[PDB]
Structure 1
Amino acid sequence: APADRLKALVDAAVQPVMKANDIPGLAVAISLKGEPHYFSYGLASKEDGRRVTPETLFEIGSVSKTFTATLAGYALTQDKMRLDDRASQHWPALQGSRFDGISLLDLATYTAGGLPLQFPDSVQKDQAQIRDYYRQWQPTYAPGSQRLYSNPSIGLFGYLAARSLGQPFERLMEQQVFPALGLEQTHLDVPEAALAQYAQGYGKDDRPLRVGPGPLDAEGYGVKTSAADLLRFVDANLHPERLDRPWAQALDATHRGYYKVGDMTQGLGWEAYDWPISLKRLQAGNSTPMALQPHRIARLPAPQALEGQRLLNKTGSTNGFGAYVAFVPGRDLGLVILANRNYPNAERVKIAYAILSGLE
């Protein structure tokens, strides 16, 4: 029967990668022809033997950037900001800084001029320290020219989008975005009542690792969610028209490409590829040099719709966790892979590619 064949396909993709990367627990969720399918493996906690289920909460790391982008899409639909705004329009503390000459689009798409991968260790999670970091920052190169993947960059984008809406980022996400998307198992700050679902993360010698506080952590990498809720978010991205109109438009804003770097087209949060494309090229787009090195961009003459024969994806990691999400708009196919070890992106993509190729 189809259930036997689908289980065989997903197990064949997952099981060797879990063994090879010593992953304690992993949850898969697939959306196929409008129907969800879940496959849960291993342990959420090795110490107490709690099993992974589709309700287990995992840290999704930088997949959070697609939620940040969705909030910004809502601010855009409301006309509270524009992507061409100067960043300092939305925060008087930045008036007269170099953010007078940097757009919100540049921040969102990592092209502001060399904002680093992470805030320096010297900037703690403190409003004044964050403010002062941005006030003094100077670009290494012209804005809009080079992509350097960056938490302070899209972090500031989310922070400013929240200011355009007159409310803190975390509050907007909890009170407005997650409810509008129908997400009740998605958190920036896990409730005490949901802690039993929060998987343990694992590092070297199985050191336990759950993400700690950092500057603009919520905007950059702070979401915890289940495979079932993250698949609900993928299904909202596959069918924005099913949501109330302002939220449909907010999702659509995350499906617009601005430039290319190699095979990858950069949207707000989402990164897109032509589909089909080889596994090696999809792995190279999600490689360590893409996360760590600047790359000159090839700007598109007009923003491009990220739909049809394309794969939209995002990797996300924390010290203890490794996530990957991908979907194919023109095929109504979605996939989520959440694990409680930060294992290589190439390996995440390997599982995903086997599944997506076999669903096709």
Structure 2
Amino acid sequence: APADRLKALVDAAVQPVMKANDIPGLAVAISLKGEPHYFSYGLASKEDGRRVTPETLFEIGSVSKTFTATLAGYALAQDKMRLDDRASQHWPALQGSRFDGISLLDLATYTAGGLPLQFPDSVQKDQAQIRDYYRQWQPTYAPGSQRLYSNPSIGLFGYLAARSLGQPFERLMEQQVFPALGLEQTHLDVPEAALAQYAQGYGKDDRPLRVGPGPLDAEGYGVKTSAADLLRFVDANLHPERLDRPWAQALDATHRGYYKVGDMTQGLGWEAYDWPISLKRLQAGNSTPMALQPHRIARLPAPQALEGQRLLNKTGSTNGFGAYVAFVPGRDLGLVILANRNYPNAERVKIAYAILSGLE
């Protein structure tokens, strides 16, 4: 009966949203009081009929920012950087630029002063072009005043965290972070031997879409993972104390809130809400205006622990994929929803809320 009831709950949440948003394939993974549960739907590739499983690789887009935040958490744990460091401390090319007056915390939490959502199309994936973009950039408004969600912002945060550790970002993630977290199905660059697991992404007219190269792609949106591996990452977040101490500290650093915008408290990578909260408020925190428009922050007098009666979440997208992760620290509950269509955040939150409400 319990297995029947959980399947009925997850099917009732997922099936209508997959039909309504024409989602070819979707993987759910749930962590419930220390037990994993998997529900897999539809096709990883329509053309060859390959089914989604909990081992199918999906692009998770901006959920990658929580991995980037974890690497920065490790640099913080090792005293290689501080959040109040000036950004230019960690990259001499930026000495004498406006990054002399911008903190690593501003970059991490999108408050550097108007760095845009994406790099402009004029900046290709090229070390010199990225360098020259930051050297010339000037804030629209005072650092630490307005949140404008931004890949160049947290991307530079991750880049500088890697520089503080003396190695390239992608190398540190592959050689140190993923192994420390027990993740063998999590990739920035999918190996040839794993390509058979890589789902197809679908856009307009079902155009096939896998993510192409871009500046600081690894830091902003580069992770491909399975539902089973992303749930292992959620379980690490629910129990940092089970990891070796420097990695436990790295994860704890991603559970600290610095300011509020509306109902949302901004951490490193993770975004948090009081729990319970209405579905409409959770959708509004994850809305298009929250992602695209500047918002004045309400700064906390001290960093706030993102634990207890809270939901921590992150949306992530690419042109072909739509991911959502949410967990409730004080209930030992975690959820992953990975799909191969970029379907609206409101609909991802609708699935998650139905499941989390039904487990509670």
Query: Normalization by structure 1: what TM-score?
Result: 1.00
Q: Deviation digits for residues 221-265 of structure 1, max 9, x if unmatched? A: 000000000000000000000000000000000000000000000
Instruction: Give the superposition deviation at 1:26.
Output: 0.1
Instruction: Give the superposition deviation at 1:291.
Output: 0.5
Question: In 2, distance between residues paired with 1:287 and 1:251?
Answer: 26
Question: In 2, distance between residues paired with 1:255 and 1:266?
Answer: 9
Instruction: Give the superposition deviation at 1:279.
Output: 0.1
Instruction: Give the superposition deviation at 1:182.
Output: 0.1
Instruction: Give the superposition deviation at 1:83.
Output: 0.1
Alignment of 1:293-332 (within 5 A): 293-332=293-332
Instruction: Give the superposition deviation at 1:104.
Output: 0.0
- Aligned to 2:327, the other structure's residue is in SS state strand
Give the length in aligned residue pairs. Answer: 360
Alignment correspondent of 2:168: 168
- Aligned to 1:44, the other structure's residue is in SS state strand
Unaligned runs of 5+ in 1: none
Q: Deviation digits for residues 157-202 of structure 1, max 9, x if unmatched? A: 0000000000000000000000000000000000000000000000
- Aligned to 1:218, the other structure's residue is in SS state helix
Instruction: Give the superposition deviation at 1:277.
Output: 0.0
Instruction: Give the superposition deviation at 1:343.
Output: 0.1
Instruction: Give the superposition deviation at 1:295.
Output: 0.1
Instruction: Give the superposition deviation at 1:357.
Output: 0.1
Alignment of 1:25-104 (within 5 A): 25-104=25-104
Instruction: Give the superposition deviation at 1:294.
Output: 0.1
Q: Deviation digits for residues 299-343 of structure 1, max 9, x if unmatched? A: 000000000000000000000000000000000000000000000
Question: In 1, distance between residues paired with 2:95 and 2:222?
Answer: 28
Question: In 1, distance between residues paired with 2:12 and 2:302?
Answer: 42
Question: In 2, distance between residues paired with 1:56 and 1:143?
Answer: 41
Instruction: Give the superposition deviation at 1:144.
Output: 0.1
Question: In 1, distance between residues paired with 2:158 and 2:241?
Answer: 24
Alignment correspondent of 1:209: 209
Alignment correspondent of 2:181: 181
Instruction: Give the superposition deviation at 1:271.
Output: 0.0
- Aligned to 2:45, the other structure's residue is in SS state coil
- Aligned to 2:194, the other structure's residue is in SS state helix
Question: In 1, distance between residues paired with 2:205 and 2:139?
Answer: 40
Question: In 2, distance between residues paired with 1:192 and 1:19?
Answer: 32
Task: State the 4+ residue runs in structure 1 displaced beyond 6 angstroms.
Answer: none
Question: In 2, distance between residues paired with 1:245 and 1:162?
Answer: 20
Question: In 2, distance between residues paired with 1:76 and 1:247?
Answer: 11
- Aligned to 2:58, the other structure's residue is in SS state strand
Alignment of 1:208-247 (within 5 A): 208-247=208-247
Question: In 1, distance between residues paired with 2:80 and 2:276?
Answer: 38
Question: In 2, distance between residues paired with 1:345 and 1:102?
Answer: 31
Question: In 2, distance between residues paired with 1:196 and 1:118?
Answer: 30
- Aligned to 1:43, the other structure's residue is in SS state strand
Alignment correspondent of 1:130: 130
Alignment correspondent of 2:192: 192
Question: In 2, distance between residues paired with 1:128 and 1:13?
Answer: 47
Question: In 2, distance between residues paired with 1:308 and 1:113?
Answer: 32
Question: In 2, distance between residues paired with 1:245 and 1:163?
Answer: 22
Query: RMSD value over aligned CA atoms?
Result: 0.2
Question: In 2, distance between residues paired with 1:335 and 1:355?
Answer: 8
Instruction: Give the superposition deviation at 1:11.
Output: 0.1
Question: In 2, distance between residues paired with 1:209 and 1:166?
Answer: 34
Question: In 2, distance between residues paired with 1:271 and 1:293?
Answer: 17
Question: In 2, distance between residues paired with 1:215 and 1:82?
Answer: 25
Question: In 2, distance between residues paired with 1:78 and 1:130?
Answer: 27
Q: Deviation digits for residues 11-68 of structure 1, max 9, x if unmatched? A: 0000000000000000000000100000000000000000000000000000000000
Instruction: Give the superposition deviation at 1:268.
Output: 0.1
